[PDB]
Amino acid sequence: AHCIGITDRDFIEGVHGGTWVSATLEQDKCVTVMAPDKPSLDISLETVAIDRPAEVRKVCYNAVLTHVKINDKCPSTGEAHLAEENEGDNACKRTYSDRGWGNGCGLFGKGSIVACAKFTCAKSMSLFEVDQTKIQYVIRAQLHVGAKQENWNTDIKTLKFDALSGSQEVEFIGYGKATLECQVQTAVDFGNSYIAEMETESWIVDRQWAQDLTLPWQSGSGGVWREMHHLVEFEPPHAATIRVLALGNQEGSLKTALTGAMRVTKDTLYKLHGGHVSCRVKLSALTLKGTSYKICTDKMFFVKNPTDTGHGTVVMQVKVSKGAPCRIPVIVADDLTAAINKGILVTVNPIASTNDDEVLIEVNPPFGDSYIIVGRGDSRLTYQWHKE
Amino acid sequence: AHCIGITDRDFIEGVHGGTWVSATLEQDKCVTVMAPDKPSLDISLETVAIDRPAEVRKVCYNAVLTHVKINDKCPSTGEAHLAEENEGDNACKRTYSDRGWGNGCGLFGKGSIVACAKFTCAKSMSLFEVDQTKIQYVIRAQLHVGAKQENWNTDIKTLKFDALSGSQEVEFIGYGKATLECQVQTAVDFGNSYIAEMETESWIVDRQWAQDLTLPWQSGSGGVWREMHHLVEFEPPHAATIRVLALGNQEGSLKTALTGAMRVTKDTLYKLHGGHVSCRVKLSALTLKGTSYKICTDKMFFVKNPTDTGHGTVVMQVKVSKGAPCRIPVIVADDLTAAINKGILVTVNPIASTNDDEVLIEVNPPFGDSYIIVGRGDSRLTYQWHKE
């Protein structure tokens, strides 16, 4: 809603005896529900969202190294010990260098040696929990009245459905109301999942995949980086010296590992670019408005000519300059002499309540050549339409 | 050279009639050539190197994007064109957005749209050529005299062999000379190769691997980054907007793709941590010195006791306080009563030319229990040795 201007669009015809009409809603997609002698309803999934999710983990992908210290003990001088060893924020390794007269010591053998470095995470990625029950589903509902596009964001009602809310009503002024009974689907799209974010970007990731990452990880309480060795390289000892290096920035590798995953985007609250809702829509309480208005008899004009919507329908915008509250007669006939309407009106029972009102009409013309006729008398507007 | 203090060590015995002795030299490894009635020769591959290599390519692994510009034309308004399209430092993409009344345009259809961004390489990797004919091979040669370790870097000669040099002579003061005829081996270690460096670190990479890298690449002459799209992401068009993002830092993935590759390190000239030289060593012109000296008869002392080298030999360091130019008698008998020498002397014919000279001895004792005897009279030093 409004489903014109949304490329992916489906139509569902309600039936005369029918009360409910079921429809599955996906994002970047919308549905127009129609019923005979009833206003058409535009329904669409606006956003899926999770507000205030809790941090489960952090994962470091860029780490700098500082303060490299080393302890070197000659053969038979015993095991080496660094003071900066049994600390927490340091990466340490135990090994044995080959030492002899060539480098200090008096014996030829294995001289114990220890190396430590200060570990600080330059850049990391946050892992939040995905509680499927906390997920809210926002749905746009808006009737097909003669509303200009510039007023579409002034007529749209929005409904939020938890993992389980009840039925919810949407009433429109003068048209009655609809009842939505939407069940959310958070299984194959909300199953094992973390919300993972780097800097500005976020994604939905497999929990097992996130936990199986070969990178240092935190708990958001204690700033103790676990499994640091994933980003620290210890070259074999020369004699006394041991070179300790930082591995590269893992931003790229992670981002390639993340291709395909559903995107997530914040705003002041996490927007989910996916998911779907299966819905049941009650239409019986919906009513047509202005069925007792007079007929707009004064000359009318096309503010916007009949143009192809791409959905197999055509839209035009008509100004009414003198008719008081009145209804606009719109048909699609195969001949200018026949008033036999062959077109299906999506904008059911057009209307003009104020003068200089620009009402939007949408019709579904028949296959073949035809004429769009709006109004009566010489005043009436006619437009040739050819549907292949 | 000196092969004591170098763990990986081999012994090659020359034969009485022999003239040439073959030996393969590898880095972090050394060979000690022995010949009866001749000074032992310490030979080792110091460094492999390439000086002033020519740049073949550059390859961008971190790029930042700036000045994103976009041109949006409505349906049937024609093809869109940016002014910044065909400048060279801009990454650009042509596409079609879905446009209608919902976003500006008056028709419903494909609106042409172009997106460009300024490309600048934040961090890159350099690729140099590996000319197998330009590679030089530095070899350490040094005789087994009674030289202290603290003088080892004062007695070593160094020879450079091109991919094809001739035989080279090394002569030592008082001991004659040796001749090296070393053929280098630069096939399976540098065949398809580039020298690839990032910041401080370098490697030897497969040429075909380097060329198949899915990253932007330069020629060092013109600063035109080819195939930029490897580090640029264009999201699908909304209506007018197109988001242009930079891909992550590729330092990490590169570094993991480089694991195993032979390392390279600079110094003021590129040191190569690999390779080997097959050699033929001439020993006939090599002579023993001081065989006409008198015998050191005055009391001597162990500056450094006989200690296991781990090479199956023992080393000690003896100070001669009073003997003039004189030779030191050393044997390894099985008994203090037997002068029968069962030990093999690596430091052939020990020597002291000045008083308070600390000459280094190395012997190969026999398996079992034995005695190391140095000097004669009561003045002689004895040391109990047990070789399992």
Curated annotation (Swiss-Prot), chains A, B:
The disulfide bonds in this chain are C3-C30, C60-C116, C60-C121, C74-C105, C92-C116, C92-C121, C182-C279, C296-C326
> Where in the cell is the protein located?
Virion membrane; Host endoplasmic reticulum membrane
Q: Residues of the signal sequence?
A: none
Q: How does it sit in the membrane?
A: Multi-pass membrane protein
Q: Which residues lie on this side of the membrane: Extracellular?
A: 1-388
Fusion peptide, as annotated region:
98-111
Mind telling me how this protein is modified after translation? Answer: N-glycosylated.
Documented effect of changing S321P? In strain: Isolate Brazil/YF-VAVD/75 vaccine and Isolate 17DD vaccine
Subunit record text: Homodimer; in the endoplasmic reticulum and Golgi. Interacts with protein prM. Interacts with non-structural protein 1.
Function, in words: Binds to host cell surface receptor and mediates fusion between viral and cellular membranes. Envelope protein is synthesized in the endoplasmic reticulum in the form of heterodimer with protein prM. They play a role in virion budding in the ER, and the newly formed immature particle is covered with 60 spikes composed of heterodimer between precursor prM and envelope protein E. The virion is transported to the Golgi apparatus where the low pH causes dissociation of PrM-E heterodimers and formation of E homodimers. prM-E cleavage is inefficient, and many virions are only partially matured.
Protein's name according to its UniProt entry: Envelope protein E
Higher taxonomy: Viruses, Riboviria, Orthornavirae, Kitrinoviricota, Flasuviricetes
- Portion of the full sequence shown: 286 to 677 of 3411
